[PDB]
């Protein structure tokens, strides 16, 4: 509920090519409010807040011109005078957000293409020269895994609602097993890279825009790629994984081939125990899910969706520990 004329005035000076009249609509749902700004010349998307939005804008803006396809940025407004809250203006991209990783409704050749493009974008993101595009201080590089292991160890300990031995074993195992090979390697890391955070062209298997960058920073690629590969280790039905489905029939590549393709795109081979990267990723996911459980156990979020995600903490922790034990020691 704000002054749309004050915005139209601001947009004339700060949004390239802008020309009213302007009509604001809202989207049903996204942490911070999202609106659809409509003008005859074109449509934009405004991301406001009640009253770290600026990092999304920053990373997405810096990536224009790279191979990581992203929505075009128009303007960021930190001056809460104009509308009563901070916001930014983006392009309104139109396309498909696919949810089910098994890609129902497609031919095998199509599934191959969706997966191949999805691969290409992660390789591209991780090969970007983040310093040349001005993101040099976008996050703290080096010492990624020990920083993260410690963070999530402290977080679980704060939210622990029950004794989960596999979690405890993880918290003790991980810190003593951080690969030494490529420990300093850093790149832009999306944070939550997966199929449903991609906007595909309405009919072609090509991503028009990588979405939800609010968790992104500078970090180790395998923290990002490892989380992305979870799909091959989680089974279908709540957490829409693809473990045990007949991938060769469906046209979905095997994880061995997917990693190999990523290695060739990025030019460097994945050194370091793959089971550690997986074990870490499962640990992290367990930590996040325990956060939800702790809030559900003392009623901050009672949602059916919420306690569903909370009950999944233990099995994630348990699965993490199993992969840990398959790793070098």
Find the part of the chain contacting Ca ion (CB under 5 A) among 37-45, 110-118, 151-159, 212-220.
212-220
For a second copy, which residue of 98, 106, 113, 243 counts as binding (CB under 8 A)? 243
192 touching Ca ion, by CB under 5 A? no
CA dist., res. 270 & res. 182, Å (int): 9
Angle between helix axes 274-297 and 144-159 (nearest 10 degrees) is: 30
**Structure-block tokens of residue 158:** 């704060």
For a second copy, which residue of 47, 126, 220, 314 counts as binding (CB under 8 A)? 314
**Structure-block tokens of residue 54:** 């600026």
Picked from Ca ion, a second copy, none, the partner binding residue 235 (CB below 5 to 8 A depending on kind) is: a second copy
Tell whether residue 197 is among the known ligand binding residues: yes
169 touching a second copy, by CB under 8 A? no
- Applying CB under 8 A, the site for a second copy has a residue count of 28
List for the chain the helix, strand, coil content (%; round to 5). 45, 10, 45
212 touching Ca ion, by CB under 5 A? yes
Dihedral through CA 281, CA 282, CA 284, CA 286, nearest 10? 170
Output the CA–CA distances (angstroms, integers) from residue 287 to 40, 158, 226, in the order listed. Answer: 47, 10, 16
For a second copy, which residue of 31, 94, 146, 238 counts as binding (CB under 8 A)? 238
For a second copy, which residue of 22, 245, 261, 297 counts as binding (CB under 8 A)? 245
47 touching a second copy, by CB under 8 A? no
251 touching a second copy, by CB under 8 A? no
Picked from Ca ion, a second copy, none, the partner binding residue 300 (CB below 5 to 8 A depending on kind) is: none
Q: For the purposes of burial, counting CB atoms within 10 Å of the CB of 118, is it exposed (0-12), middle (13-18) or buried (19 or more)?
A: buried
For a second copy, which residue of 29, 105, 237, 267 counts as binding (CB under 8 A)? 237
Output the CA–CA distances (angstroms, integers) from residue 308 to 288, 292, 301, 311, in the order listed. Answer: 13, 9, 11, 6
Asked if residue 21 has a cis previous peptide bond (ω within 30° of 0), the answer is yes
Residue sitting closest to Ca ion (CB): 212
Q: Which residues pair with 36 in a beta bridge?
A: 25, 45
38 touching a second copy, by CB under 8 A? no
Q: Which is nearer to a second copy, 33 or 315 (CB)?
A: 315
Structural contact between residues 103 and 110, judged by C-beta atoms closer than 8 angstroms: yes
Structural contact between residues 281 and 227, judged by C-beta atoms closer than 8 angstroms: yes
Element (H, E) at 25: strand 23-26
311 touching a second copy, by CB under 8 A? yes
* Contacts to Ca ion from residues 300-329, by CB under 5 A: none
| Pairing label, strands 43-47, 198-200 | unpaired
For a second copy, which residue of 40, 175, 244, 269 counts as binding (CB under 8 A)? 244
Give me the sign of the Cα torsion angle 282, 284, 287, 289: negative
- Applying CB under 5 A, the site for Ca ion has a residue count of 2
214 touching Ca ion, by CB under 5 A? no
Q: Which is nearer to Ca ion, 197 or 275 (CB)?
A: 197
Q: Which residues are annotated as a binding site for Ca(2+)?
A: 197, 212
Q: Which residues are annotated as a binding site?
A: 197, 212
What residues line the site for a second copy (CB under 8 A)?
A: 102, 104, 166, 232-238, 243-246, 255-256, 311, 314-315, 317-323, 325-326
């Amino acid at each position: 509920r704000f002054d749309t004329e004050a915005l139209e005035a601001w947009m004339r000076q700060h949004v390239e090519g802008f020309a009213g009249p302007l009509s604001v609509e809202q989207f049903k749902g996204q942490s911070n409010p999202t609106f659809k700004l409509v003008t005859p010349g074109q449509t934009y998307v405004m991301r406001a807040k009640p009253g770290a939005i600026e990092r999304e804008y920053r990373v997405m803006d810096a990536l224009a011109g790279t191979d990581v396809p992203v929505a075009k940025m128009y303007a960021l407004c930190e001056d809460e005078s104009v509308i009563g809250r901070a916001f930014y203006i983006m392009e309104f991209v139109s396309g498909r957000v696919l949810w089910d990783q098994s890609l129902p409704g497609m031919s095998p050749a199509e599934r191959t293409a969706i997966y191949d493009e999805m691969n290409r974008v992660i390789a591209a993101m991780h090969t970007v020269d983040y310093q040349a595009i001005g993101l040099g201080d976008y996050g703290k590089p080096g010492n990624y895994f020990q920083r993260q292991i410690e963070r999530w160890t402290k977080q679980y300990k704060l939210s622990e609602t029950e004794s989960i031995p596999a979690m405890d074993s993880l918290m003790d195992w991980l810190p003593q097993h951080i690969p030494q090979e490529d420990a300093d390697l850093t790149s832009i890391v999306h944070g939550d890279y997966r199929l449903d955070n991609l906007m595909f062209h309405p009919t072609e298997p090509r991503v028009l825009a990588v979405l939800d960058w609010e968790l992104s920073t500078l970090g180790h690629p395998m923290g990002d790629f490892g989380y992305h590969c979870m799909s091959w280790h989680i089974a279908p039905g709540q957490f829409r994984g693809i473990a045990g489905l007949d991938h060769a029939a469906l046209g979905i590549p095997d994880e061995a081939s997917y990693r190999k393709l990523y290695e060739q795109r990025t030019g460097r081979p994945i050194t370091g125990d793959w089971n550690f990267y997986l074990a870490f990723s499962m640990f992290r996911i367990a930590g996040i899910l325990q956060g939800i459980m702790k809030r559900v156990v003392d009623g901050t979020a009672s949602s059916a969706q919420a306690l569903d995600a909370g009950k999944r903490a233990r099995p994630m922790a348990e699965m993490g520990w199993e992969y840990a034990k398959k790793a070098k020691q």
